[PDB]
């Protein structure tokens, strides 16, 4: 599951260039557009009827900031992702009732968003490192389900 020192440096280097608020809104929005059954958790967010209605939805954007904010904080703890995300794992299970498969879907969408943003800079080895990261985060968020 773990990254080489070169991969950790690659992850940190790229993330320094990431506008977390913006990428968060983009990633959550694309999740709800590409996999629209994931809208089941966001009835209170209002209009989700078109791609533009989703991507520009202020509540989607706001929640995307929150989600990727927590993701970003976790990048400082790649050696202990399960510990880092334990309380959020418990919350998503016990209070929010979110199938952890959703974390895997979000991870893949985030990778696509990073590719879209960075272009050729998102090289195959950099992707590989980020695939390790999103798998690790999704597994950590799933770990305390019961």
């Amino acid at each position: 599951v773990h990254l080489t020192p070169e991969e950790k440096s690659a992850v940190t280097a790229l993330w320094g260039k990431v506008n977390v608020d913006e990428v968060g809104g983009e990633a959550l929005g694309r999740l709800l557009v590409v996999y629209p059954w994931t809208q089941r958790f966001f009835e209170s967010f209002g209009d989700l009827s078109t791609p533009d209605a989703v991507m520009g939805n202020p509540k989607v954007k706001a929640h995307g900031k929150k989600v990727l904010g927590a993701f970003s904080d976790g990048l400082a703890h790649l050696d202990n992702l399960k510990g880092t995300f334990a309380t959020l794992s418990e919350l998503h299970c016990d209070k929010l009732h979110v199938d952890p498969e959703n974390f895997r879907l979000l991870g893949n969408v985030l990778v696509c968003v990073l590719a879209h943003h960075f272009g050729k800079e998102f090289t195959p080895p950099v992707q590989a490192a980020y695939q390790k990261v999103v798998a690790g985060v999704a597994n950590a968020l799933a770990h305390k389900y019961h």
């Binding site: 629209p36 299970c93 009732h97 979110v98 389900y145 019961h146």
Partner: protein
């Protein structure tokens, strides 16, 4: 694609199940909740206590849908049309969970059909449940 041989195997096996179908549906749900606890995230509004009448009632609904699918195995997309609508537009269960329930249905059948659960029938039942799952997720996006 369900072969003519698959359809005969499924009809015979479910025929043997008979009026035990609702019971086996409930057992499959219980096995699923225990073996794959993430599936419980779709039932926070349920009473999930041991022997839950609400789970048993849901088991009967799932079983009745499967019984109807067997009876219309030549035309399952049409027979399951209303149910597929509900899954796509309301329930919105992630597709990965259909494989979990299918597996638990297979385990339930295996535990109750010592003679009928041959390797060939096992194969046919797995294809059938996968086919039902495909129909139920066919309108998701």
């Amino acid at each position: 694609v369900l072969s003519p041989a698959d359809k005969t195997n499924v009809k015979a096996a479910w025929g043997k199940v008979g009026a035990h179908a609702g019971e086996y549906g409930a057992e499959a749900l219980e096995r699923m909740f225990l073996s794959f606890p993430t599936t419980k995230t779709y039932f926070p509004h349920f009473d999930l206590s041991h022997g839950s009448a609400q789970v048993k009632g849901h088991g009967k609904k799932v079983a009745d849908a499967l019984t109807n699918a067997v009876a219309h195995v030549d035309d399952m997309p049409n027979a399951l049309s209303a149910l597929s609508d509900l899954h796509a537009h309301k329930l919105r269960v992630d597709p990965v969970n259909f494989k979990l329930l299918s597996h638990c249905l297979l385990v339930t059948l295996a535990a109750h059909l010592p003679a009928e659960f041959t390797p060939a029938v096992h194969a046919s039942l797995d294809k059938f449940l996968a086919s039902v799952s495909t129909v139920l997720t066919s309108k998701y996006r």
